[PDB]
Design a protein around this motif. Sequence first.
Motif, PDB file in Angstrom:
ATOM      1  N   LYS A 213       0.869  -1.219   0.000  1.00 22.32           N
ATOM      2  CA  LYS A 213       0.000   0.000   0.000  1.00 22.32           C
ATOM      3  C   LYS A 213       0.899   1.261   0.000  1.00 22.32           C
ATOM      4  CE  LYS A 213      -4.342   1.741   2.091  1.00 22.32           C
ATOM      5  NZ  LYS A 213      -5.259   1.247   1.046  1.00 22.32           N
ATOM      6  N   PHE A 214       0.606   2.209  -0.885  1.00 24.67           N
ATOM      7  CA  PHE A 214       1.533   3.331  -1.191  1.00 24.67           C
ATOM      8  C   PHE A 214       0.756   4.526  -1.716  1.00 24.67           C
ATOM      9  CE2 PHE A 214       4.648   5.465  -3.921  1.00 24.67           C
ATOM     10  CZ  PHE A 214       5.679   5.670  -3.037  1.00 24.67           C
ATOM     11  N   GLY A 215       0.873   5.649  -1.004  1.00 28.95           N
ATOM     12  CA  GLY A 215       0.251   6.888  -1.471  1.00 28.95           C
ATOM     13  C   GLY A 215      -1.230   6.621  -1.658  1.00 28.95           C
ATOM     14  N   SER A 216      -1.791   7.048  -2.783  1.00 28.31           N
ATOM     15  CA  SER A 216      -3.234   6.852  -3.112  1.00 28.31           C
ATOM     16  C   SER A 216      -3.502   5.484  -3.772  1.00 28.31           C
ATOM     17  CB  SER A 216      -3.695   7.997  -3.970  1.00 28.31           C
ATOM     18  OG  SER A 216      -2.988   8.075  -5.197  1.00 28.31           O
ATOM     19  N   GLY A 217      -2.529   4.573  -3.773  1.00 33.09           N
ATOM     20  CA  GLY A 217      -2.665   3.282  -4.454  1.00 33.09           C
ATOM     21  C   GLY A 217      -1.688   2.253  -3.930  1.00 33.09           C
TER      22      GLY A 217
ATOM     23  N   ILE B 166       2.094   8.750  -6.064  1.00 31.98           N
ATOM     24  CA  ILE B 166       3.195   9.180  -5.142  1.00 31.98           C
ATOM     25  C   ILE B 166       2.774  10.456  -4.419  1.00 31.98           C
ATOM     26  CG2 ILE B 166       5.561   9.899  -4.869  1.00 31.98           C
ATOM     27  CD1 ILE B 166       6.086   8.530  -7.709  1.00 31.98           C
ATOM     28  N   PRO B 167       2.814  10.521  -3.066  1.00 34.39           N
ATOM     29  CA  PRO B 167       2.548  11.793  -2.371  1.00 34.39           C
ATOM     30  C   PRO B 167       3.547  12.883  -2.796  1.00 34.39           C
ATOM     31  CG  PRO B 167       2.408   9.926  -0.862  1.00 34.39           C
ATOM     32  CD  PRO B 167       3.015   9.387  -2.149  1.00 34.39           C
ATOM     33  N   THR B 168       3.078  14.009  -3.355  1.00 31.82           N
ATOM     34  CA  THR B 168       3.995  15.021  -3.945  1.00 31.82           C
ATOM     35  C   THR B 168       4.837  15.695  -2.857  1.00 31.82           C
ATOM     36  OG1 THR B 168       2.476  16.879  -3.964  1.00 31.82           O
ATOM     37  CG2 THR B 168       2.439  15.426  -5.887  1.00 31.82           C
TER      38      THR B 168
HETATM   39  C1  LIG Z   1      -0.663   4.361   2.072  1.00 34.20           C
HETATM   40  C2  LIG Z   1      -0.490   5.687   2.827  1.00 34.20           C
HETATM   41  C3  LIG Z   1      -1.247   5.657   4.167  1.00 34.20           C
HETATM   42  C4  LIG Z   1       1.000   5.957   3.086  1.00 34.20           C
HETATM   43  O1  LIG Z   1       1.782   5.965   1.883  1.00 34.20           O
HETATM   44  N1  LIG Z   1      -1.062   6.781   1.941  1.00 34.20           N
HETATM   45  C5  LIG Z   1      -1.026   8.107   2.194  1.00 34.20           C
HETATM   46  O2  LIG Z   1      -0.515   8.549   3.218  1.00 34.20           O
HETATM   47  C6  LIG Z   1      -1.642   9.043   1.189  1.00 34.20           C
HETATM   48  C7  LIG Z   1      -2.821   8.715   0.520  1.00 34.20           C
HETATM   49  C8  LIG Z   1      -3.362   9.602  -0.394  1.00 34.20           C
HETATM   50  C9  LIG Z   1      -2.743  10.815  -0.648  1.00 34.20           C
HETATM   51  C10 LIG Z   1      -1.577  11.142   0.023  1.00 34.20           C
HETATM   52 CL1  LIG Z   1      -0.814  12.704  -0.240  1.00 34.20          CL
HETATM   53  C11 LIG Z   1      -1.028  10.261   0.929  1.00 34.20           C
END
Ligand SMILES: CC(C)(CO)NC(=O)c1cccc(Cl)c1
Lengths: 172, 171
Positions: free
Chosen positions: A11-15, A32-34
Amino acid sequence: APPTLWSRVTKFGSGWGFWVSPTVFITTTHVIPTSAKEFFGEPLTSIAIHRAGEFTLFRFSKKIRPDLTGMILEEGCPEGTVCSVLIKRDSGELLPLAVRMGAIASMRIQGRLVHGQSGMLLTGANAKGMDLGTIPGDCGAPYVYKRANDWVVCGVHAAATKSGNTVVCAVQ
Amino acid sequence: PTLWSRVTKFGSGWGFWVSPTVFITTTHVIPTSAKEFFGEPLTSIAIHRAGEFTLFRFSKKIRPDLTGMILEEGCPEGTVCSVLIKRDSGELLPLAVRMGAIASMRIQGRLVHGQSGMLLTGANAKGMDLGTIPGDCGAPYVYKRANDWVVCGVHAAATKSGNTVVCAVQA
Ligand SMILES: CC(C)(CO)NC(=O)c1cccc(Cl)c1
Protein backbone atom coordinates in the motif's frame (compact mmCIF):
# COMPACT_ATOMS: atom_id res chain seq x y z
CA ALA A 1 -0.96 -16.24 -8.21
CA PRO A 2 2.02 -17.29 -5.99
CA PRO A 3 2.18 -15.90 -2.39
CA THR A 4 5.69 -14.43 -3.05
CA LEU A 5 4.14 -12.07 -5.74
CA TRP A 6 1.30 -10.95 -3.39
CA SER A 7 3.91 -10.24 -0.58
CA ARG A 8 5.58 -7.65 -2.94
CA VAL A 9 2.33 -5.63 -3.39
CA THR A 10 2.58 -2.70 -0.89
CA LYS A 11 0.00 0.00 0.00
CA PHE A 12 1.53 3.33 -1.19
CA GLY A 13 0.25 6.89 -1.47
CA SER A 14 -3.23 6.85 -3.11
CA GLY A 15 -2.66 3.28 -4.45
CA TRP A 16 0.06 0.60 -4.56
CA GLY A 17 3.64 -0.24 -5.50
CA PHE A 18 5.66 -3.43 -6.11
CA TRP A 19 9.04 -4.77 -4.85
CA VAL A 20 10.99 -6.18 -7.91
CA SER A 21 13.97 -6.91 -5.60
CA PRO A 22 15.21 -6.05 -2.04
CA THR A 23 16.39 -2.58 -3.41
CA VAL A 24 13.94 -1.83 -6.36
CA PHE A 25 10.32 -0.57 -5.91
CA ILE A 26 8.04 0.40 -8.86
CA THR A 27 4.76 2.39 -8.91
CA THR A 28 2.47 4.69 -10.92
CA THR A 29 3.75 8.30 -10.91
CA HIS A 30 0.38 9.92 -9.97
CA VAL A 31 -0.13 7.84 -6.71
CA ILE A 32 3.20 9.18 -5.14
CA PRO A 33 2.55 11.79 -2.37
CA THR A 34 4.00 15.02 -3.95
CA SER A 35 5.16 16.34 -0.47
CA ALA A 36 7.06 13.08 0.46
CA LYS A 37 10.83 13.51 1.37
CA GLU A 38 11.32 10.06 3.10
CA PHE A 39 10.50 6.46 1.88
CA PHE A 40 10.93 3.28 4.03
CA GLY A 41 13.09 5.28 6.55
CA GLU A 42 15.51 6.57 3.78
CA PRO A 43 15.90 10.26 2.80
CA LEU A 44 15.41 11.31 -0.89
CA THR A 45 19.22 11.93 -1.14
CA SER A 46 19.83 8.11 -0.68
CA ILE A 47 17.39 7.07 -3.52
CA ALA A 48 17.85 6.96 -7.36
CA ILE A 49 14.49 7.78 -9.04
CA HIS A 50 13.89 6.81 -12.73
CA ARG A 51 10.62 8.35 -14.09
CA ALA A 52 9.08 7.69 -17.57
CA GLY A 53 5.62 9.37 -17.77
CA GLU A 54 3.24 7.27 -15.51
CA PHE A 55 6.07 4.74 -14.63
CA THR A 56 8.38 5.46 -11.63
CA LEU A 57 11.25 3.21 -10.36
CA PHE A 58 12.95 3.80 -6.92
CA ARG A 59 16.42 2.18 -6.33
CA PHE A 60 17.55 2.19 -2.62
CA SER A 61 21.21 2.15 -1.35
CA LYS A 62 20.31 -0.60 1.25
CA LYS A 63 18.16 -3.80 1.20
CA ILE A 64 14.69 -2.58 2.34
CA ARG A 65 13.07 -6.04 1.62
CA PRO A 66 15.82 -8.68 2.24
CA ASP A 67 13.14 -11.47 2.46
CA LEU A 68 12.74 -11.15 -1.38
CA THR A 69 14.49 -12.54 -4.45
CA GLY A 70 15.12 -10.25 -7.47
CA MET A 71 12.67 -11.13 -10.34
CA ILE A 72 12.54 -10.10 -14.11
CA LEU A 73 11.02 -6.67 -15.01
CA GLU A 74 10.36 -6.17 -18.72
CA GLU A 75 9.16 -3.19 -20.85
CA GLY A 76 5.58 -4.49 -21.39
CA CYS A 77 4.86 -7.88 -23.04
CA PRO A 78 4.13 -9.39 -26.49
CA GLU A 79 0.68 -8.54 -28.00
CA GLY A 80 -1.76 -11.33 -27.02
CA THR A 81 -0.08 -12.17 -23.65
CA VAL A 82 -2.69 -12.85 -20.91
CA CYS A 83 -1.56 -11.14 -17.64
CA SER A 84 -3.06 -10.92 -14.10
CA VAL A 85 -3.31 -7.49 -12.37
CA LEU A 86 -2.64 -8.20 -8.62
CA ILE A 87 -5.30 -6.03 -6.91
CA LYS A 88 -5.79 -6.05 -3.06
CA ARG A 89 -9.35 -5.20 -1.86
CA ASP A 90 -11.36 -4.67 1.43
CA SER A 91 -10.15 -7.27 3.94
CA GLY A 92 -7.34 -9.58 2.78
CA GLU A 93 -9.37 -10.11 -0.43
CA LEU A 94 -7.04 -10.73 -3.39
CA LEU A 95 -8.36 -10.00 -6.97
CA PRO A 96 -6.00 -11.22 -9.79
CA LEU A 97 -7.93 -9.70 -12.75
CA ALA A 98 -7.26 -11.45 -16.12
CA VAL A 99 -6.28 -9.00 -19.00
CA ARG A 100 -5.41 -9.75 -22.70
CA MET A 101 -2.60 -7.29 -23.59
CA GLY A 102 -2.57 -5.23 -26.85
CA ALA A 103 -0.62 -2.37 -28.52
CA ILE A 104 1.27 0.58 -26.97
CA ALA A 105 -1.38 3.37 -26.89
CA SER A 106 -2.06 7.03 -26.08
CA MET A 107 -5.61 7.76 -24.73
CA ARG A 108 -7.71 10.41 -22.93
CA ILE A 109 -9.43 8.86 -19.82
CA GLN A 110 -11.65 11.01 -17.56
CA GLY A 111 -10.08 14.12 -19.27
CA ARG A 112 -6.45 12.98 -18.39
CA LEU A 113 -3.83 11.99 -21.07
CA VAL A 114 -2.36 8.46 -20.46
CA HIS A 115 0.33 6.45 -22.34
CA GLY A 116 1.36 2.76 -21.85
CA GLN A 117 0.46 -0.78 -22.99
CA SER A 118 -3.32 -1.15 -23.52
CA GLY A 119 -5.27 -4.30 -22.55
CA MET A 120 -8.84 -5.70 -22.35
CA LEU A 121 -10.17 -7.27 -19.11
CA LEU A 122 -11.38 -10.90 -19.47
CA THR A 123 -13.69 -10.71 -16.38
CA GLY A 124 -17.18 -10.01 -17.99
CA ALA A 125 -19.12 -8.39 -20.89
CA ASN A 126 -18.24 -4.93 -19.44
CA ALA A 127 -16.15 -4.35 -16.28
CA LYS A 128 -18.04 -1.22 -15.00
CA GLY A 129 -17.85 -1.15 -11.14
CA MET A 130 -15.70 -2.81 -8.42
CA ASP A 131 -16.90 -6.50 -8.64
CA LEU A 132 -15.54 -7.21 -12.19
CA GLY A 133 -13.26 -4.16 -12.83
CA THR A 134 -10.73 -1.62 -11.48
CA ILE A 135 -11.22 1.46 -9.24
CA PRO A 136 -8.96 4.55 -8.92
CA GLY A 137 -7.35 3.15 -5.72
CA ASP A 138 -5.99 0.14 -7.75
CA CYS A 139 -3.39 2.34 -9.53
CA GLY A 140 0.17 1.01 -9.04
CA ALA A 141 -0.93 -2.70 -8.94
CA PRO A 142 1.45 -4.93 -10.95
CA TYR A 143 0.81 -6.70 -14.32
CA VAL A 144 2.41 -10.22 -14.11
CA TYR A 145 2.45 -13.38 -16.26
CA LYS A 146 4.04 -16.84 -16.17
CA ARG A 147 6.57 -17.94 -18.90
CA ALA A 148 5.61 -21.52 -17.84
CA ASN A 149 8.79 -21.82 -15.73
CA ASP A 150 9.03 -18.34 -14.11
CA TRP A 151 6.95 -15.19 -13.51
CA VAL A 152 7.63 -11.74 -15.13
CA VAL A 153 6.37 -8.26 -14.06
CA CYS A 154 5.86 -6.00 -17.11
CA GLY A 155 4.36 -2.79 -15.60
CA VAL A 156 1.92 -1.02 -13.20
CA HIS A 157 -1.76 -0.06 -13.41
CA ALA A 158 -2.16 3.55 -14.67
CA ALA A 159 -5.81 4.03 -15.81
CA ALA A 160 -9.04 2.36 -16.95
CA THR A 161 -12.08 3.57 -18.97
CA LYS A 162 -15.22 4.41 -16.93
CA SER A 163 -17.67 2.02 -18.55
CA GLY A 164 -15.39 -0.30 -20.33
CA ASN A 165 -12.98 -3.20 -20.45
CA THR A 166 -9.90 -1.10 -21.41
CA VAL A 167 -6.90 -0.73 -19.00
CA VAL A 168 -3.43 0.91 -19.44
CA CYS A 169 -0.20 -0.64 -17.94
CA ALA A 170 2.62 2.02 -17.54
CA VAL A 171 5.94 0.45 -18.77
CA GLN A 172 9.68 1.16 -18.20
CA PRO B 1 -22.51 -3.83 -0.74
CA THR B 2 -20.90 -6.46 -3.11
CA LEU B 3 -21.91 -9.62 -5.09
CA TRP B 4 -18.76 -11.29 -3.64
CA SER B 5 -20.22 -11.29 -0.02
CA ARG B 6 -22.96 -13.66 -1.40
CA VAL B 7 -20.41 -16.41 -2.44
CA THR B 8 -20.06 -18.82 0.55
CA LYS B 9 -17.97 -21.98 1.19
CA PHE B 10 -20.39 -24.97 1.29
CA GLY B 11 -19.79 -28.75 1.39
CA SER B 12 -17.10 -29.74 -1.15
CA GLY B 13 -17.51 -26.42 -3.11
CA TRP B 14 -19.46 -23.11 -2.89
CA GLY B 15 -22.92 -21.55 -3.10
CA PHE B 16 -24.64 -18.16 -3.56
CA TRP B 17 -27.16 -16.10 -1.50
CA VAL B 18 -29.89 -14.86 -3.92
CA SER B 19 -31.77 -13.22 -1.00
CA PRO B 20 -31.78 -13.24 2.83
CA THR B 21 -33.68 -16.62 2.69
CA VAL B 22 -32.63 -18.21 -0.70
CA PHE B 23 -29.28 -20.08 -1.27
CA ILE B 24 -28.35 -21.89 -4.60
CA THR B 25 -25.53 -24.48 -5.14
CA THR B 26 -24.45 -27.48 -7.25
CA THR B 27 -26.21 -30.70 -6.15
CA HIS B 28 -22.99 -32.86 -6.00
CA VAL B 29 -21.15 -30.50 -3.50
CA ILE B 30 -23.95 -30.75 -0.82
CA PRO B 31 -23.09 -32.82 2.32
CA THR B 32 -24.86 -36.22 2.27
CA SER B 33 -24.89 -36.35 6.14
CA ALA B 34 -26.39 -33.26 7.93
CA LYS B 35 -28.97 -32.15 10.57
CA GLU B 36 -28.61 -28.33 10.01
CA PHE B 37 -27.16 -25.76 7.54
CA PHE B 38 -26.12 -22.24 8.72
CA GLY B 39 -27.50 -23.03 12.23
CA GLU B 40 -31.04 -23.84 10.93
CA PRO B 41 -32.43 -27.39 11.45
CA LEU B 42 -32.95 -29.27 8.12
CA THR B 43 -36.51 -29.74 9.55
CA SER B 44 -37.28 -26.05 8.54
CA ILE B 45 -35.50 -25.87 5.10
CA ALA B 46 -37.29 -26.38 1.71
CA ILE B 47 -35.00 -28.19 -0.85
CA HIS B 48 -35.80 -27.91 -4.63
CA ARG B 49 -33.46 -30.08 -6.77
CA ALA B 50 -33.31 -30.24 -10.62
CA GLY B 51 -30.30 -32.35 -11.75
CA GLU B 52 -27.07 -30.49 -10.78
CA PHE B 53 -29.06 -27.31 -9.63
CA THR B 54 -30.29 -27.15 -5.97
CA LEU B 55 -32.20 -24.24 -4.28
CA PHE B 56 -32.60 -23.94 -0.47
CA ARG B 57 -35.41 -21.74 1.02
CA PHE B 58 -34.91 -21.00 4.81
CA SER B 59 -37.80 -20.25 7.27
CA LYS B 60 -35.96 -17.16 8.66
CA LYS B 61 -33.54 -14.46 7.41
CA ILE B 62 -29.99 -15.97 7.41
CA ARG B 63 -28.50 -12.96 5.49
CA PRO B 64 -30.68 -9.94 6.47
CA ASP B 65 -27.86 -7.63 5.17
CA LEU B 66 -28.74 -8.63 1.52
CA THR B 67 -31.39 -7.53 -1.01
CA GLY B 68 -33.15 -10.07 -3.29
CA MET B 69 -31.63 -10.48 -6.80
CA ILE B 70 -33.13 -11.75 -10.16
CA LEU B 71 -32.69 -15.53 -10.71
CA GLU B 72 -33.34 -16.78 -14.29
CA GLU B 73 -33.15 -20.22 -16.07
CA GLY B 74 -29.88 -19.62 -17.97
CA CYS B 75 -29.33 -16.67 -20.36
CA PRO B 76 -29.50 -15.91 -24.13
CA GLU B 77 -26.81 -17.52 -26.35
CA GLY B 78 -23.90 -15.12 -26.88
CA THR B 79 -24.25 -13.51 -23.40
CA VAL B 80 -20.80 -12.97 -21.77
CA CYS B 81 -21.40 -14.17 -18.14
CA SER B 82 -18.94 -13.85 -15.21
CA VAL B 83 -18.28 -16.99 -13.10
CA LEU B 84 -17.58 -15.59 -9.51
CA ILE B 85 -14.90 -18.08 -8.33
CA LYS B 86 -13.60 -17.99 -4.68
CA ARG B 87 -10.41 -19.94 -3.84
CA ASP B 88 -9.27 -21.24 -0.38
CA SER B 89 -6.12 -19.04 -1.04
CA GLY B 90 -8.30 -15.89 -0.45
CA GLU B 91 -8.35 -15.08 -4.25
CA LEU B 92 -11.54 -13.81 -5.99
CA LEU B 93 -11.39 -14.79 -9.73
CA PRO B 94 -14.16 -13.36 -11.95
CA LEU B 95 -13.80 -15.00 -15.41
CA ALA B 96 -15.75 -14.10 -18.62
CA VAL B 97 -17.66 -17.08 -20.11
CA ARG B 98 -19.37 -16.89 -23.55
CA MET B 99 -22.68 -18.87 -23.17
CA GLY B 100 -24.11 -21.43 -25.66
CA ALA B 101 -27.07 -23.83 -25.89
CA ILE B 102 -28.52 -25.96 -23.08
CA ALA B 103 -27.39 -29.58 -23.70
CA SER B 104 -26.44 -32.96 -22.15
CA MET B 105 -22.60 -32.92 -22.44
CA ARG B 106 -19.91 -35.60 -21.93
CA ILE B 107 -17.38 -34.06 -19.42
CA GLN B 108 -14.50 -36.31 -18.12
CA GLY B 109 -16.55 -39.53 -18.62
CA ARG B 110 -19.96 -38.33 -17.20
CA LEU B 111 -23.14 -36.77 -18.69
CA VAL B 112 -23.94 -33.30 -17.31
CA HIS B 113 -27.10 -31.33 -18.31
CA GLY B 114 -26.95 -27.49 -18.30
CA GLN B 115 -25.97 -24.38 -20.31
CA SER B 116 -22.65 -24.76 -22.21
CA GLY B 117 -19.99 -22.00 -22.00
CA MET B 118 -16.42 -21.22 -23.18
CA LEU B 119 -13.93 -18.98 -21.22
CA LEU B 120 -12.57 -15.85 -23.06
CA THR B 121 -9.06 -16.84 -21.62
CA GLY B 122 -9.42 -19.80 -24.08
CA ALA B 123 -5.99 -20.92 -25.31
CA ASN B 124 -5.03 -23.26 -22.40
CA ALA B 125 -2.34 -23.40 -19.64
CA LYS B 126 -4.78 -21.91 -17.04
CA GLY B 127 -2.06 -22.67 -14.37
CA MET B 128 -2.14 -18.84 -13.96
CA ASP B 129 -5.65 -18.07 -12.41
CA LEU B 130 -7.11 -18.33 -15.97
CA GLY B 131 -9.45 -21.38 -15.72
CA THR B 132 -11.68 -23.47 -13.40
CA ILE B 133 -10.59 -26.30 -11.02
CA PRO B 134 -12.82 -29.05 -9.46
CA GLY B 135 -13.10 -27.26 -6.04
CA ASP B 136 -14.86 -24.29 -7.81
CA CYS B 137 -18.23 -26.15 -8.24
CA GLY B 138 -21.27 -24.15 -6.97
CA ALA B 139 -19.73 -20.74 -8.02
CA PRO B 140 -22.43 -18.49 -9.60
CA TYR B 141 -22.83 -17.37 -13.25
CA VAL B 142 -23.95 -13.66 -13.33
CA TYR B 143 -24.29 -10.82 -15.87
CA LYS B 144 -25.41 -7.16 -15.91
CA ARG B 145 -28.67 -6.36 -17.78
CA ALA B 146 -29.74 -2.68 -17.65
CA ASN B 147 -28.77 -1.54 -14.09
CA ASP B 148 -29.60 -5.05 -12.82
CA TRP B 149 -27.40 -8.07 -12.01
CA VAL B 150 -28.93 -11.47 -13.03
CA VAL B 151 -27.84 -14.82 -11.58
CA CYS B 152 -28.50 -17.57 -14.16
CA GLY B 153 -26.93 -20.76 -12.65
CA VAL B 154 -24.11 -22.54 -10.77
CA HIS B 155 -20.78 -24.12 -11.88
CA ALA B 156 -21.41 -27.96 -12.35
CA ALA B 157 -18.40 -29.22 -14.44
CA ALA B 158 -15.46 -28.39 -16.80
CA THR B 159 -13.27 -30.17 -19.39
CA LYS B 160 -9.61 -31.05 -18.55
CA SER B 161 -8.48 -27.57 -19.85
CA GLY B 162 -10.92 -25.79 -17.42
CA ASN B 163 -12.00 -23.70 -20.53
CA THR B 164 -15.22 -25.58 -21.71
CA VAL B 165 -17.78 -25.41 -18.80
CA VAL B 166 -21.38 -26.34 -17.80
CA CYS B 167 -23.70 -23.96 -15.80
CA ALA B 168 -26.52 -25.96 -14.04
CA VAL B 169 -29.84 -24.03 -14.38
CA GLN B 170 -33.21 -23.89 -12.53
CA ALA B 171 -36.20 -25.96 -13.85
C1 LIG C 1 -0.66 4.36 2.07
C2 LIG C 1 -0.49 5.69 2.83
C3 LIG C 1 -1.25 5.66 4.17
C4 LIG C 1 1.00 5.96 3.09
O1 LIG C 1 1.78 5.97 1.88
N1 LIG C 1 -1.06 6.78 1.94
C5 LIG C 1 -1.03 8.11 2.19
O2 LIG C 1 -0.51 8.55 3.22
C6 LIG C 1 -1.64 9.04 1.19
C7 LIG C 1 -2.82 8.72 0.52
C8 LIG C 1 -3.36 9.60 -0.39
C9 LIG C 1 -2.74 10.82 -0.65
C10 LIG C 1 -1.58 11.14 0.02
CL1 LIG C 1 -0.81 12.70 -0.24
C11 LIG C 1 -1.03 10.26 0.93
